[PDB]
Paper text:
We next assessed the ability of small molecules to differentially inhibit human BET and CgBdf1 BDs by evaluating the ability of BETi compounds JQ1, I‐[name], bromosporine (BSP) and PFI‐1 to inhibit binding to an H4ac4 peptide in a homogeneous time‐resolved fluorescence (HTRF) assay. While these compounds potently inhibited human Brd4 BD1 and BD2 (IC50 values of ≈10–100 nM), consistent with previous reports, they inhibited CgBdf1 BDs more weakly (IC50 values between 0.5 and >100 µM; i.e., a 10‐ to 1000‐fold reduction in sensitivity) and failed to inhibit C. glabrata growth in vitro. These results demonstrate that small molecules can strongly discriminate between human BET and CgBdf1 BDs. To rationalize these data, we determined the crystal structure of the highest affinity CgBD/BETi complex, CgBD2 bound to I‐[name]. CgBD2 undergoes a minor conformational change to accommodate IBET‐151: in unbound CgBD2, the side chain of “YPF‐shelf” residue Tyr327 adopts a gauche minus (g−) conformation, stabilized by a sulfur‐π interaction with residue Met395, whereas, in the complex, Tyr327 adopts the trans conformation to avoid a steric clash with I‐[name], thereby widening the ligand binding pocket. The shorter side chains (Cys340, Val392) and altered conformation (Glu331) of three CgBD2 residues further widen the binding pocket and reduce the number of hydrophobic contacts with I‐[name]. Consistent with this observation, the Brd4 BD1 pocket buries more of the ligand's solvent‐accessible surface area (SASA) compared to CgBD2 (55.4% vs. 47.2%). The looser fit of these BETi compounds within the more spacious CgBD1 and CgBD2 binding pockets explains their reduced potency relative to human BET BDs.
The fungal Bromodomain and Extra‐Terminal (BET) protein [name] is a potential antifungal target against invasive fungal infections. One attractive target is the fungal BET protein [name], a global transcriptional regulator. BET proteins bind chromatin through their two bromodomains (BDs), BD1 and BD2, which specifically recognize histones acetylated on lysines. We show that [name] is essential in C. glabrata, and that inactivation of both [name] BDs induces lethality.
Numbering used by the authors: 301 to 416
Write the structure that this text describes.
């Protein structure tokens, strides 16, 4: 499982993506999509690997991420799911783009090398 420096970097990115500073557009991505409560019963027709920021946060703190690439895959899945179910021009599509660009910016400074 991921080492200390890489884990603390990942915690910082995930904490930043979930911060209340960004609550006006990260809120739909804090918890898993509930198609029954949200009245979109065809969500799982389009999304086969659901993911949310809270799930990524728990997997990280649960020592489930072997490396930073695995975390990037999961976080990318949040937005791939969003754009797959929500067409261009919808609110949550715009919010997903806003949050994903923040993620790309923070992730650009990820450690590239490991040193046990
Ligand atoms: C309108 O889309 C959502 C709205 C949500 C949501 C998750 C989604 C969502 C996500 C994320 N991916 O697909 C869907 C559908 N999760 C919680 C939540 N609480 C909540 O009030 N909403 C409403 C309906 C909403 C509508 C448009 C933009 C932002 N939020 C939502």
């Amino acid at each position: 499982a991921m080492g200390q420096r890489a884990m603390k970097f990942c915690q910082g990115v995930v904490r930043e993506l979930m911060s209340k500073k960004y609550a006006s557009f990260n809120y739909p991505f804090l918890e898993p999509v509930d198609p029954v409560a949200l009245n979109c019963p065809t969500y799982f027709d389009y999304v086969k690997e659901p993911m949310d920021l809270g799930t990524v946060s728990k997997k990280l703190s649960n020592w489930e991420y072997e490396n930073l690439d695995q975390a990037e895959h999961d976080i990318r899945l949040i937005f791939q799911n969003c754009y797959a179910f929500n067409p261009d021009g919808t609110i949550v599509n715009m919010m997903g783009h806003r949050l994903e660009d923040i993620f790309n910016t923070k992730w650009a400074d990820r450690p590239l090398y490991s040193d046990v």
